[PDB]
């Protein structure tokens, strides 16, 4: 019925979904690819979106993270590794992406996720915000953690894939 | 390939809130259930016949929304209707808590069910059915927070 309308995305049943999942991934974790790899199993799509210019200064950089990330989820068909440097509602809109997905690990962030969520609603109304929680087995590690752990030496290849506990390794001498 | 998601509450009765969190929901998976539960450990205002009739009638005008009342583990009927997400609408940071662990505990009862959170418009974020039930019963105008056929039948209900 294309002569007479295009579609609206609401009301009218289910439409192809396109997920981003920002962040700095440095590096990616095991928590990081659960959360894909839960995303793709329900998403068309999925891009893993690299922050190129973090507020804090990376361990790895732009190029590093997207090679490790790009490795660590290529078994995944429906995902796709990008870095940038905008907004995620920008992004999302430039990518024509309708869902961004947040990793909600802990309650002091909760209130900081609402009002994300509210501020990318203003800004692009048609991108949802979709919260997934971690797995147990995940719940507490953090890129930041596993840095810290591995600086003074402790076992963190239970966290890690292969590709990025070696780099991580050079990284640390 | 599908997805087919349940939205389970008590829906006691059914808000705008609710009926915004299935809309958006509805537009991402291919089938919801509303799954209303039918014996929740409080006593609710209206009896489960009432409540999905209520949410049947609010939710009428999305094709790929279903309103089902259950009575049984909430991974058997999931099992039972062949779905692998399940959704909250996720509005306090108190309920975050409990949904988390409940999360967990449907991970070890399914592991093939995904639990999804999405939390809602700025416009609903403060009210529950509770909230207005509350101050209905004394007469604060809550016409902002139901669709009608649920209005008249609060009104009915104090009267």
Known sequence: ????????????????????????FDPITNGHIDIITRAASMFDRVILAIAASPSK???????????????????????????FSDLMANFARAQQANILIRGLRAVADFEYEMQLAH?????????????????????????SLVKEVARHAGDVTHFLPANVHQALMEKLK
């Open 1 to 24: 019925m294309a002569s007479m309308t295009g579609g609206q995305q609401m009301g009218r049943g289910s439409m192809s979904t396109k997920a981003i999942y920002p962040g700095t």
């Open 57 to 83: 200064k990376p361990m790895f950089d732009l190029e590093e993270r997207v090679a490790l990330a790009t490795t660590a989820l290529q078994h995944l068909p429906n995902v796709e590794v990008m870095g």
């Open 119 to 143: 501020m990318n609603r203003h800004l692009m109304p048609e991108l949802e915000s979709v919260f997934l929680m971690p797995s147990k087995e995940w719940s507490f590690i953090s890129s």
